[PDB]
């Protein structure tokens, strides 16, 4: 396990395990997938856009 | 045991060059350590779009410098004969050091 944080690693480890499980017995999918363990969570840190403070956090204005 | 380090702004200009340096020396001597990629260093330039005020304009620029390795071990005259003679790329700067 390398990269990220331990919370992220826990999840990756969870994928790897779910995956190997399938090699051992392909027939596992049919029951291992309804839980989605075989899905690669694509949620990721959003780029920090200029103009805004954090991709989205928008600077505030006074008496507009 | 010569190590070649090719760099350039254009990735295909290297892919091109590096490929040659391999196919060439792939005869007169060893088959080379194979051309290796190597991470790319990247320059960023964030410049306010317009002159005067408008601190929120910006526009992003970047100068990406690519790298390669090749690495030829076991030089045999002709191995170096296929080199010094045949050259081409312009956007490719070479570094040969054993």
């Amino acid at each position: 396990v390398r990269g990220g944080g331990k919370s992220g690693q826990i999840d990756a480890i969870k994928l790897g395990i779910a995956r190997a499980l399938v090699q051992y017995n392909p027939d596992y999918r049919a029951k291992l997938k309804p839980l989605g363990f075989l899905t690669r969570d694509a949620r990721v840190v959003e780029r920090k856009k200029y103009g805004k403070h954090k991709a989205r956090r928008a600077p505030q204005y006074s008496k507009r | 045991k010569i190590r070649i380090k090719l760099r350039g702004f254009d990735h295909k200009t290297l892919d091109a060059s590096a490929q040659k340096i391999v196919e060439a020396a792939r005869r007169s001597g060893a088959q080379v350590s194979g051309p290796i990629p190597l991470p790319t260093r990247v320059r960023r330039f964030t410049v306010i779009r317009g002159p005067f005020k408008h601190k929120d304009s910006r526009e992003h620029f970047e100068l990406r410098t690519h790298n390669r390795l090749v690495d030829i071990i076991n030089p045999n005259r002709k191995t170096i004969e296929q080199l010094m003679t045949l050259d081409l790329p312009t956007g490719v700067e070479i570094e040969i050091k054993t």
Partner: protein
Amino acid sequence: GNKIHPIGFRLGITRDWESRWYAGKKQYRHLLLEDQRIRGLLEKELYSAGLARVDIERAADNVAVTVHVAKPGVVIGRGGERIRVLREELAKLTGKNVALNVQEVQNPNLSAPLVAQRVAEQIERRFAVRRAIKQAVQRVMESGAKGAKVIVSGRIGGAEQARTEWAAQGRVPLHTLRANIDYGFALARTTYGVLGVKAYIFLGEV
């Protein structure tokens, strides 16, 4: 205030640079100044010939320089004596021992940079802006092209209230990042102020 440079917008794609030379983190700000210094002259002592692009390559104190022109004869010189004057007077800017070239423009009607110059030219004389534009759009369209567009800005006709004349034919899809649209701009010093002149030429696509 909008619209990206149509060229800069597609450098990665359909559009190579006008200076292509390897790395250099300690000399970049020197070769560049040079490339500039270069273009300096070339975009002067080479105007009347159709200076439509000055490419430049390098490789250790060796400059290429490829001046593209519509009238190379004017570049070369009588029998070929000026291209000799350039080269020398040129290496006076930089030692380097730099080459030179003169590739011609096969039909300047499809060269945006040139078209800009023609229209800016007439304006500088005193032609009817609107006309100049309509005609140029025509020529460019007249000699092939899938689309064309010209834009003169300033105090059109010496008027006091600045305006902007349009004119365009066929397609000029500035958004389609792959169209391959040649862009060109031309100034226009006048008895009463400047006038910008923009030319867009759409060629093929893929």
